[PDB]
Amino acid sequence: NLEEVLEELEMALLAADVGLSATEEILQEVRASGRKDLKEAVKEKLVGMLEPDERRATLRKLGFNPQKPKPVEPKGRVVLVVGVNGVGKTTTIAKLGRYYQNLGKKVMFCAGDTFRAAGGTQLSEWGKRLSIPVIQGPEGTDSAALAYDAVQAMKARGYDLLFVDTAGRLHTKHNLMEELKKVKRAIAKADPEEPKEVWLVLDAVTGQNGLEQAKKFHEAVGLTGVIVTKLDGTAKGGVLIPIVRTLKVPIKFVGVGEGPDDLQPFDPEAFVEALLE
């Protein structure tokens, strides 16, 4: 009965890329709760390992039900977007431009990827489609200098938000990770209080290596949020569970397509429902 359900649940979590460590910790806790209807206790538990801001979770526990959602808002004016090669950094920035421009914000982009072929022109094209200014330079230009110039332009023009794109880089390359830190330092040089947000982009199809990526980028630049892309596919993005549980970095948005509007604020409930099929 219950043992078959726990066995089923273990497979479902593993298939969702949650990992052995977190999967066992979840099942052990649910088994100890004495709850008859597992699955539901699991959903309740997971909707907890997907949100470190705490309070909203505590409220449902005390027999309350306060909500509002409220559009996600950057703490500051600069958002540094980081991540490994191919995850969706550039396209996510285009979507963030659309999302905030719809909220009346004046947005600007910095085509920080001066390393990869067409890395900057790709973002420039999105800016053109969205009528959003894009600061870019010839391939080979120093990313830090470009970011510095971007922040200066943003301040001089009175823009509300600046999204800094970065070239893809594997977390195992110390030199490229140092470059990322240099970019963050350049931003702070143009404005001492920035960047207030450093968001990691993760591909939903990623397996357990996603935890290592999150750990390394967090150690390098101090993440304040994560965006999971390609959730329109069959991958559930389960590696987020171990990530949020170990690093306590909040999930800001989910990417669900390749169009400018294919971005949605993270919804714990919906995400967990999908993860468990």
Ligand X SMILES: Nc1nc2c(ncn2[C@@H]2O[C@H](COP(=O)(O)OP(=O)(O)CP(=O)(O)O)[C@@H](O)[C@H]2O)c(=O)[nH]1
How many residues touch ligand X (CB under 6 A)?
23
Residue list 90-109, contact with ligand X (CB under 6 A) = 90-91
230 touches 198 (CB < 8 A): no
Residue 102 exposure: Cα atoms within 13 Å on the Cβ side: 11
Nearer residue to ligand X within complex by CB, 127 or 168: 168
Quick check: bond before 71 cis, omega within 30? no
116 binds other proteins (CB under 8 A): yes
| Residue 14 interacts with other proteins (CB under 8 A): yes or no | yes
**What backbone torsions phi and psi does residue 50 show, to the nearest 5 degrees?**
-130, 40
Residue 17, classified by CB atoms within 10 Å of its CB into exposed (0-12), middle (13-18) or buried (19+), is buried
Q: Is 23 annotated as belonging to a binding site?
A: no
The correct pick among 44, 257, 264, 274 for binding ligand X (CB under 6 A) is 257
Name the minimum Å distance from CB 77 to ligand X. Answer: 22
Of 276, 271, 273, nearest in space to 256 by CA? 271
Residue 90, both tokens:
């550039």
Cβ neighbour number for residue 213 with a 10 Å cutoff: 24
Among 12, 30, 113, 150, binds ligand X (CB under 6 A): 113
Smallest distance, Mg ion to C-beta of residue 214, A: 19
Q: Which of 2, 11 has the CB closer to other proteins? A: 11
On whether 86 is known to bind a ligand per the annotation, the reply is: yes
Q: Which stretch binds other proteins (CB under 8 A): 45-53, 163-171, 188-196, 261-269?
A: 163-171
89 and 166 Cβ atoms separated by less than 8 Å: yes
Check residue 251 for interaction with other proteins (CB under 8 A).
Answer: no
Tokens of 204: 């939903």
Query: Is the torsion defined by CA of 199, 88, 204, 73 positive or negative?
Result: positive
Task: Kindly state whether residue 90 participates in binding Mg ion, applying the rule CB under 5 A.
Answer: yes
Can you tell me the distance from the alpha carbon of 143 to that of 210, in angstroms, rounded to the nearest whole number? 25
Q: Which tokens belong to 153? A: 């332009």
Residue 229 is labelled as binding a ligand: yes
Decide which of ligand X, Mg ion, other proteins, none touches 205; Cβ closer than 5 to 8 Å per partner kind: other proteins
Closest CA to 213 of 86, 76, 90: 86
Q: Tell me whether residue 42 or residue 162 sits nearer to ligand X (CB atom).
A: 162
Residues that bind other proteins (CB under 8 A): 11, 14-17, 19-20, 84-88, 116-118, 121-122, 125-126, 129, 168, 170-172, 203, 205-210, 212, 230, 232-235, 239, 258
Residues that bind ligand X (CB under 6 A): 83, 85-91, 113, 116, 119, 167-168, 170, 229-230, 232-233, 255-258, 262
User: Which residues participate in the annotated binding site for GTP?
Assistant: 83-90, 165-169, 229-232
